């Protein structure tokens, strides 16, 4: 992917947080109060 | 320490420390073996009994874990508390400290938890015995001196706290949360309580508001009432009694929503009501403000006595006190039905004799002018306004206007607010109205108008006992069918008798402010009057205001400051209330519209007022969403947009000052601090938004009555001087006046300074100059407070013109309204039967030191002055009696209270 497929990735995750806990918290807060590989075999067979 | 067997008796608590015989072993055997042995059991629990008593002052902990080992194991291991029933439940009283010794004195992490569980039920079962109750008191008033009960005895009562306070927070509730195991009620944890109340109240304090706060009910607070009231004199005087009682109410405050916390106030004035203290009843009356409380005060003084006695004088002028007059109106006519003298009661619970009072103090601080003596255009204007500005309260200057030279060159709305500047000399004054007419029979419209307005400003001081009503004179102008005149007619009837809601004054301004649907600019006063009316009690919440707001908004949108002027008086009219108000706020809502948004922020910030935390955070995401969306999208429009940012900020900062006043004063501090942070945030992000912010603030500290008076102002006003709107500089003055020439000797300097300098427009210079003027009152006349000052919490009505004016760009119109900024503050004087003008000694104390009460009664040290002074601002407030050397015994205890001290000398 590179740097730039990374970029678009770690951004997307990180908005949808900041946006939401801007305000989840505040309210939330306040609501009480009012084997190293080898062979990797498999015993299963596949095609 | 170390074993040395049975030799004496001295050295059996020596052998005991390392294994019990007594204790151990023996009764072990016993119990795990014959049950005729449940017999020499019951003898040996006094033995028993007796051996901790001795070793309590022993603190190691090995010695009394390891010593009491397999007593803690044999609760359900071999006794199973139900070979011998009855006996083990008797014989639970030295096993309960076994428990304890590994809860507190041992920590071992995995039993210190579970055993806490254990505790708890056990103290419910053995507490039905009621010999529970004697466990704890034995360790409570104490016996023996080591560190150890110091902390464990918190934790046996930690656990009726624990459950308490838990059924508020899950629903379920009772001993089905096994977090306690516990019942939350039934007859045999009740009787644990009220019993443990007793002990804790006489020798500690903590856990006596603990449990109150926790069943929620206005009910536990009325089983205190009963208990303290036997107290109230001959455990410990009525002093000690009232400081306790309000220390929990006071503390308490921030975490009580509305219904509750007026609940639980009323049961505090009631205890002071049974008490001797009557004076300590009438101010926690006032607190709540409803009408039924205050009716109970003022009764129980008037009506048993036949005779005129002490009883007469008394009720009249606790009456007096408040100068919302609320009180005052409610009070009057018991005077005249009951006839032993109407004309000494009438007058004196009126605000006619505090009118007299002034003169006395007027003598002392005497005139000093400092007026600009600057004419011709806009200058003119200024001085003549600044005029009255310095001559605020009973002043004398009658001369000076006389010259009717410097009157007539005032101009347009200028000549309005001239006459209007006229009343404010006569401001609390029966004279005066002669200056007024001269104007009001000649000339063009304006002077007319002008000639209302001081009319208003002056009957603040006389308008009531039916001793020339503003009522009386400004009926007549209402009638008049011009707009002007009629609009100003009823801007002085609402601040004159202010809180006063008496059937002619309410009831003449109740078809009216009912008409909105012609275009007209000044009908902003329709409402804004009533609001006014409203404040200092109770509202309706009146469905005259609340159907007109909505027909404005239906007929125009045109006339931008019309709206503006609206959305506020429906805000100022809900003041005095806050449980009803979180009603209208739906209602309002209803009706959506985003010019609707903009009413209901404002109108959140009553109804949330009191336990208002949930109210801050909202009142910053509103600020920060119009720069926020737009940060998305970047990786008729015009009035409604300006409506809305606008009341957002008012918003903040009316809820802000309202909780930090009634909430803890440490608090006080910590929110002018996010204050900063929101401008600071504004400045940058929205160059509209920071205009705003600027006038907001200097009303934000008047309000909340900040402790620190010299750096603030001072530093935020030099920034501002660059800043555009030189109406930030009157706001900041307001709070700077002070205990006048303390604060308010820097602020002339600094407000001077920007002005005198620059000169680039006399608009801009108009503002500077009138803020200046206002600041001071010349050798302590008097002082401004947003509060109350009969109680430190409270909050006028007479302030309200000045905290309503501070959300609208500068206009000349506005100047009109500006004359008006009442809210005196009488000087206390020592009153006798002949009416004695003087005070003999005073304690003034600038800094309680009591930590008892967060308000802090005054200390009885002080530092002494003299006669005649006036009752000081801020570092000066706590103010102790000085007499009771003479042999003069107060009957009004004064704190520092807006109130007249009275004494009776033996």
Redesign the interface.
Same mark, same amino acid.
């Given at each position: 992917e590179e740097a730039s497929g990374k970029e678009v990735e770690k951004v997307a995750t990180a908005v949808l947080s900041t946006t939401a806990r801007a305000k989840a918290r505040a309210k939330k807060t306040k609501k009480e109060k009012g084997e190293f590989y080898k062979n990797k075999y498999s015993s299963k067979p596949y095609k | 320490m170390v074993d040395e067997s049975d030799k004496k008796q001295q050295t059996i608590d020596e052998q005991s420390q390392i294994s019990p015989e007594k204790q151990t072993p023996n009764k072990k055997d016993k119990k795990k073996e014959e049950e005729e042995q449940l017999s020499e059991e019951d003898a040996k629990l006094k033995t028993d009994l007796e051996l901790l008593v001795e070793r309590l002052k022993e603190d190691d902990s090995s010695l009394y874990e390891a010593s009491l080992n397999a007593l803690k194991e044999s609760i359900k291991n071999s006794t199973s508390s139900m070979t011998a029933v009855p006996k083990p439940l008797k014989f639970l009283r030295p096993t309960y400290p076994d428990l304890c010794s590994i809860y507190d004195k041992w920590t071992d992490p995995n039993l210190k938890s579970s055993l806490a569980d254990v505790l708890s039920i056990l103290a419910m079962t053995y507490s039905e015995n009621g010999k529970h109750d004697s466990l704890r008191y034995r360790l409570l008033s104490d016996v023996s001196d080591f560190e150890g009960w110091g902390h464990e005895y918190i934790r046996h009562l930690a656990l009726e706290i624990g459950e308490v306070y838990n059924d508020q $927070?899950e629903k379920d509730a009772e001993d089905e949360t096994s977090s306690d195991g516990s019942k939350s009620d039934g007859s045999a944890a009740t009787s644990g309580f009220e019993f443990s109340k007793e002990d804790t109240l006489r020798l500690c304090l903590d856990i006596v508001p603990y449990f109150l706060k926790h069943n929620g009910e206005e009910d536990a607070v009325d089983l205190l009432l009963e208990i303290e009231s036997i107290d109230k004199l001959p455990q410990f005087v009525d002093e000690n009694t009232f400081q306790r009682v309000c220390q929990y109410m006071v503390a308490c405050v921030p975490?009580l929503?509305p219904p509750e916390d007026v609940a639980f106030l009323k049961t505090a004035y009631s205890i002071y009501l049974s008490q001797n203290e009557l004076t300590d009843a009438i101010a926690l009356a006032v607190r709540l403000g409803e009408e039924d409380m205050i009716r109970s005060v003022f009764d129980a003084t008037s009506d048993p006595v036949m005779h005129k006695q002490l009883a007469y004088i008394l009720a009249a002028q606790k009456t007096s006190f408040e100068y919302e007059g609320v009180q005052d109106i409610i009070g009057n006519g018991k005077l005249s039905e009951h006839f032993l003298y109407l004309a000494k009661e009438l007058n004196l619970t009126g605000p006619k004799v505090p009118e007299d009072i002034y003169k006395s103090h007027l003598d002392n601080s005497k005139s000093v002018f400092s007026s600009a003596g600057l004419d011709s255009a806009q200058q003119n204007l200024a001085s003549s306004f600044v005029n009255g500005f310095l001559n605020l309260g009973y002043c004398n200057d009658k001369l000076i206007v006389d010259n009717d030279n410097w009157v007539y060159k005032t101009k347009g709305d200028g000549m309005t607010s001239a006459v209007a500047s006229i009343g404010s000399i006569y401001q609390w004054n029966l004279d005066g109205l002669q200056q007024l007419d001269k104007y009001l029979y000649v000339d063009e419209p304006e002077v007319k108008a002008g000639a209302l307005l001081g009319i208003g400003i002056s009957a603040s001081g006389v308008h009531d006992g039916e001793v020339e009503p503003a009522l009386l004179l400004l009926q007549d102008y209402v009638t008049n069918p011009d707009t002007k005149i009629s609009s100003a007619a009823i801007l002085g009837l609402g601040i004159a008798f202010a809180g006063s809601k008496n059937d002619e004054v309410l009831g003449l301004l109740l078809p009216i402010a009912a008409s909105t649907d012609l275009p007209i600019e000044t009908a902003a006063m329709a409402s804004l009057a009533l609001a006014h009316v409203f404040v200092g009690t109770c509202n309706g919440d009146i469905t005259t205001s609340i159907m007109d707001n909505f027909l404005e908004r239906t007929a125009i949108e045109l006339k931008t400051d019309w709206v503006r002027f609206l959305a506020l008086a429906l805000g100022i009219l809900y003041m005095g209330q806050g449980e009803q108000v979180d009603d209208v706020l739906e209602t309002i809502s209803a009706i959506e519209h985003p010019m609707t948004s903009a009413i209901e922020v404002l109108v959140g910030s009553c109804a949330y007022t009191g336990?208002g935390? $949930?109210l801050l955070?909202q009142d910053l995401?509103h600020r920060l969403t119009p720069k926020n969306v737009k940060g998305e999208e970047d990786?008729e429009i015009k009035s409604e947009e300006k409506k809305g940012k606008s009341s957002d900020k008012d918003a903040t900062t009316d809820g802000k000052n309202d909780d930090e006043e009634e909430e803890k004063e440490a608090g006080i501090v910590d929110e002018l601090a996010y204050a900063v942070l929101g401008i600071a945030l504004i400045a940058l992000g929205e160059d509209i938004g920071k205009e705003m912010s600027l006038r907001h603030f200097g009303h934000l500290m008047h309000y909340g009555n900040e402790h620190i008076r010299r750096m603030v102002p001072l530093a935020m006003g030099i920034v501002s001087v660059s800043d555009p709107q030189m109406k930030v500089f009157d706001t900041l003055t307001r709070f700077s006046h002070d205990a006048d020439l303390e604060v308010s000797m820097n602020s002339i300097f600094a407000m001077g300074l920007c002005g005198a300098g620059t000169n680039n427009a006399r608009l801009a210079q108009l503002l500077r100059q009138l803020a200046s003027y206002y600041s001071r009152e010349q050798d302590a006349l008097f002082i401004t407070r947003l509060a109350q000052g009969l109680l430190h919490l409270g909050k006028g009505t007479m302030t309200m013109d000045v905290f309503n004016d501070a959300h609208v760009l500068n206009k000349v119109t506005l100047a009109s309204i500006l004359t008006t900024a009442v809210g005196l503050v009488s000087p206390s004087f020592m009153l006798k039967h002949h009416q004695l003008f003087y005070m003999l000694n005073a304690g003034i104390r600038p800094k309680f030191i009591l930590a008892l009460n967060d308000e802090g009664e005054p200390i009885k040290v002080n530092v002494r002055v003299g006669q005649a002074v006036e009752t000081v601002g801020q570092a000066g407030r706590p103010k102790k009696i000085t007499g009771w050397i003479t042999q003069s015994t107060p009957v009004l205890l004064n704190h520092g209270e807006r109130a007249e001290l009275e004494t009776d000398e033996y």
């Open positions: - | $927070v975490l929503p336990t935390d $949930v955070i995401l990786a």
